[PDB]
Design a protein around this ligand. Sequence first.
Ligand SMILES: N[C@@]1(C(=O)O)CO[C@@H]2[C@@H](C(=O)O)[C@@H]21
Ligand SMILES: N[C@@]1(C(=O)O)CO[C@@H]2[C@@H](C(=O)O)[C@@H]21
Ligand SMILES: [Ca+2]
Ligand SMILES: [Ca+2]
Ligand SMILES: [Ca+2]
Ligand SMILES: [Ca+2]
Lengths: 745, 745
Amino acid sequence: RREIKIEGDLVLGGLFPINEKGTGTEECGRINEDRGIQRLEAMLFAIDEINKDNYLLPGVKLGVHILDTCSRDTYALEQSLEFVRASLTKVDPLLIAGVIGGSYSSVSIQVANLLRLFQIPQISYASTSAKLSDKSRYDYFARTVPPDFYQAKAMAEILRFFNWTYVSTVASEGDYGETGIEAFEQEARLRNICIATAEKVGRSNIRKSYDSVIRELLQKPNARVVVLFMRSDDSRELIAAANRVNASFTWVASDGWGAQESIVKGSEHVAYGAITLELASHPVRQFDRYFQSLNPYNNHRNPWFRDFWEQKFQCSLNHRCDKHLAIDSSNYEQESKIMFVVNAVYAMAHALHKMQRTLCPNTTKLCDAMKILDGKKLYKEYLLKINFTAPFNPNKGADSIVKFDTFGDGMGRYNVFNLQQTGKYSYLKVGHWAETLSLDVDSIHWSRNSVPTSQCSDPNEMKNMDVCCWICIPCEPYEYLVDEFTCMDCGPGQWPTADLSGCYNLPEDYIKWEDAWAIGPVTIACLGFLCTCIVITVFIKHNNTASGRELCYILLFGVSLSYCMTFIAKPSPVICALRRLGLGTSFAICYSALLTKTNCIARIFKNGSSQVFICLGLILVQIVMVSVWLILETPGTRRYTLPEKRETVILKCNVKDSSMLISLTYDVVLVILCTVYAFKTRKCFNEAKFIGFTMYTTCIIWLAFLPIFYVTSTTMCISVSLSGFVVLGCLFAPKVHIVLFQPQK
Amino acid sequence: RREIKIEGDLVLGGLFPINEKGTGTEECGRINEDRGIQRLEAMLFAIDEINKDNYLLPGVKLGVHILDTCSRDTYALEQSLEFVRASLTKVDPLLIAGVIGGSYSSVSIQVANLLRLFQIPQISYASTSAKLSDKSRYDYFARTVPPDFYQAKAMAEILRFFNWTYVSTVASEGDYGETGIEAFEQEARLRNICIATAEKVGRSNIRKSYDSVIRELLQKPNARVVVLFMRSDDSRELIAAANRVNASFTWVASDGWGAQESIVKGSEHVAYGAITLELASHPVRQFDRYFQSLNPYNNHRNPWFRDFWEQKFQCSLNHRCDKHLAIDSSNYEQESKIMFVVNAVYAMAHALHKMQRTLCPNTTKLCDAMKILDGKKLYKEYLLKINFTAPFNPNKGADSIVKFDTFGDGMGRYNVFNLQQTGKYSYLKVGHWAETLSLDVDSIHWSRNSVPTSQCSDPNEMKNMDVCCWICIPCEPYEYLVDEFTCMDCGPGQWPTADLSGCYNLPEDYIKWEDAWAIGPVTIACLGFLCTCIVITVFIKHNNTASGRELCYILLFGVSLSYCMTFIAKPSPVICALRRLGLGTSFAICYSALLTKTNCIARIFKNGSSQVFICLGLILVQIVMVSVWLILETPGTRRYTLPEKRETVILKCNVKDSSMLISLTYDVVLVILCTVYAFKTRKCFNEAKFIGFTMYTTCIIWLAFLPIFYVTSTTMCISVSLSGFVVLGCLFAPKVHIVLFQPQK
Ligand SMILES: N[C@@]1(C(=O)O)CO[C@@H]2[C@@H](C(=O)O)[C@@H]21
Ligand SMILES: N[C@@]1(C(=O)O)CO[C@@H]2[C@@H](C(=O)O)[C@@H]21
Ligand SMILES: [Ca+2]
Ligand SMILES: [Ca+2]
Ligand SMILES: [Ca+2]
Ligand SMILES: [Ca+2]
């Protein structure tokens, strides 16, 4: 029953959330101080200016009929019956020309359903919902604010500028809530952003108590950023709930939080470093002088003013204030959406003015054609196509024109704010969004002094798979990352290095390839023993002071050290069939010299020759001839590849054996020398015993080389020393030959 | 302007979706045939019976005022103004006592917001929404149907009976849609059920065209079951959309689909084998006789009847039908929710009757206390506490009583239906839900002749991690599954079998343990050569036909075969220090016999004894004495554990060497025999040459055994043969001893 009623030629209706919603069974509680009284006085300020105007409806007078919604749709519908009571019954009164819509989206939707049955146009400030643009249902609705379709974009792009991909969302209940968060999740999918958890709040049948949600947000510590689509009532509670548990996140809030300094009262340190959006606006300078001149004495026409005055100053009319200073800059700051309220009222003023110019061109008063207002004509023809410059706002660009579009909406421009500290707390604009996000990172005061990170999983290891959570799996050094999501093998000899995007570091040693570089050091150590045999053989030759034959055998024994060192022309002489033939001839060369000195010069014939000597020398020549024909292709490498990936064949100047060629060459070389041993075996002479005694050791030495001949990998180097030891053992036979002589010469 | 108006002492208001929603700009389209006219005639049937009653309001007469909603909330609000026009203006008419609520939940919510301002009670059949129970807002609402809080339970338990854990949900838009699916996802979490995808349908700003959703359902083939919370309009479209793309799922639908045979018309094969819920009900037998007697001639009072008649028979009043049979069993079947409609009307009848008994006890007519109905008194005191037996329904248990509860709701009982084929199609009830799911699996006709499965991931392999999707990772046979979600290691010798929940099959061969069982077969093959030495030694002894000393040496040589076979008392004689000492004595025993026969009986003294003989025999006695003191602990096993897990030591009666004990024993045994070899080495006699010649082979044989002594793993068996070959080589020395003799004896 409490209202403001100022009569006039034409009457306007208003709906403001002057009183905050009640706690329990009471309808509505305390007084809304910023989004309440201030917005109410803005409409009363504009009406005064319009009646003072001369080019905007100078003949008619504008009246008002302002009610209060108490931030409830059910309470709003009951009040809104006064705007339709006169028109409902007419056959046997105040006829409202239009309604300045409510603030909350649920209130605007509820009223727009009723007024559309009477063809009464409605413009709603501050109500930004995407579902209010469906003109097939709300065919008499318009607004001066952009929809929420553009607010979801502006926050899905801040979460993409910073690489925040794992987030958690909290939304209110109503129509600003679910519809706001339903649009956000579609804009998150297009940018590969994942949602950890999605909760809801409210007042009925949701079961949070604002503490279950806080715990549910703490169950996913990998998501350090929370996206909020909530009203002003729920934003104060959730911050207070987080203060008790002493939690801390970074808050990304829509315009419901806005840039109010009252939501974070008493719980500042839990909201420090927040990031919030707010519609673009410019303060109306003329309004500030109007508000600051008000006091409970001269402001008789405002009924709710007395309740506002006491609540703001903690006085009463519990200290009972007379000489108390009125509203001034020390305790007052203009609300953000005052410009949108003034613009909405002028929208009715210009739309009605064009009606009067056309329908009654002769007179400036209300002609008889205005006795019955046409709601459909005033909306579809006049209101929806207005265009004028914003009053009280000096030209600031493209935002100085008040105009609707095909859906009867506004322009999607936003700001970006951040909560900081200087112990005093305040906001600071650090960004913008006009179809493109353009913010300033440098000035931001972050929550924990560093840019927060929130991704599902942390980043030479494969990582397979949802586009946010992976598993870092390492793979063995014999597999290379073909792509970032797979490592499958690598090269046999090549040893990949650093990132294994390919197979690098071509390994000269791969079993089949001889890495070498260390056998030379082993050869140097082994060369000392070989030189001793040459040195020992040299001393034996000097003791001679027939003779040429003994020297030739020593050369074959001496050639063993050279053959052992070359075991030659290239780094890997074993490669190629000729190399095996060439190596086999050297072994048979020593045997041939010893075999020739055995019976070649030992006269002719106990119980127990030109043809035999020719046949014996023919085999060596044939072996030498085969080796001679293999002069080319003497180089090569030994094939000893084993399942172990690191198989560098350490040998003198690399490992060169021709793989299976050396195996045949090793057996063939024994056969060439075996002819001399076999010939001497048919003697079962003192010199024969020395040859036989040396022959017995040769058979034993060959047996030891047999495991070495089939043993490789080191083991091949040990087997290599076995071949050298065989030459040294053969040199032992030359020592027996020196024994097979006479002293005192 | 089209309505039914029958005057009376008290008037009731109704709201029915008689006309289906319009296609485009037209308000409402064709005629709803089952949930339309039939439900309308049910209320007109009950009103006729009540006026015929004598114990239920016999003095007053009941009137009706029935309107049509065209399945739209906006159209419903416009019509519902007739019920409040008279009461709104009274200072200077039909006063509706109550309203039989609408069918769709959005319609009921919209009207309940308006009627609560005039204190007009409303009972709504067929409207099942969870948010309508919040009595703080809807304080004048009641229903005869259970809320949707119980429908979500009854389907989250069918998805738990069958192990369907990966599902996809499709929901409508309105209040029956989102609120129905928001309750389901909470009941799915409590049973570890996961949601693949969640889509929405509608008519504005959702952007499906019923084909994007179908494709989105096909992008997750692992989810073969779809859960539907949709109205009757969207259920026909989505089935038609799936028919074009020729897709196929199994459908789990709420009561919006119900058990109608019209949703699946023309697209049966895409809905075959569906599973749907429907409220528990029993057909009203009296109603069937009433409906079947109707025809467009005697049913003057029904305005929409003529449109219904032509649409049902494809006639006109394009063939123009007179002698056409009326409604009968050949083309008619009673709708499910006719019992709930009749019950709601009687709820007003009994509530009003109790008012008349109390307020006007003297007269059966309307006393002056009824000139002003008290809406609050009629609802809170009388209507909400009624209790009576259901008319026209014979006693069928606890469902025969019509009663509300604290919230003004009904009882949560449901049925379970299934779509089958006999080419004709029909439904069949195969289940029930009264606080407990009790269905019958056997009779179900499944979509693809088998029980469908839908889980995120498929089931000796670890499976780690969301409670639906895992990764099956196998682990190597040396690791056992400590739990189902981890395999980390196993036992060294034990070889796990079948499921690796533990480490089983205690491996007797673990490198450190000797598996054996195959060395015996190798010993048998090796025993043949050893027997040849014994056989050869036996022949040498028989040739003798001094002597005792030679036989003792042969016994030491013969003991080598026994020592080799025992290399004895236990399966692994090498274990224990005594075993190494015992084995070493056997090797020194042969050397001692040969050493004693060398110079013990060879007189006293080229250039080159009791004390020396005593000292030489003392070492063998000390070695034998040490071995004798180690009689106990002769058993044991050889330690040859290597990184390869399968390390069964194959040897005669297992591998027994005492690990490092055998290594010391092998070296110690050589030292015991080395004393004899060292003593003979100081001779640089024909027999000395034979001993020296045999001694030379012993040094070479020891060198070969040196790699065998340090070579194991097979290799140990080869090394074992090396020790046996050493005994055979020593037996070769006894052959030289036989050579060191005289023939012709
Ligand atoms: N955007 C809001 C809406 O109701 O649509 C959310 O809460 C605040 C109203 C206001 O600023 O007055 C807006
Ligand atoms: N449960 C429903 C509801 O509107 O709440 C869903 O669609 C069908 C109405 C009917 O059976 O008449 C019901
Ligand atoms: Ca409001
Ligand atoms: Ca809202
Ligand atoms: Ca309806
Ligand atoms: Ca609905």
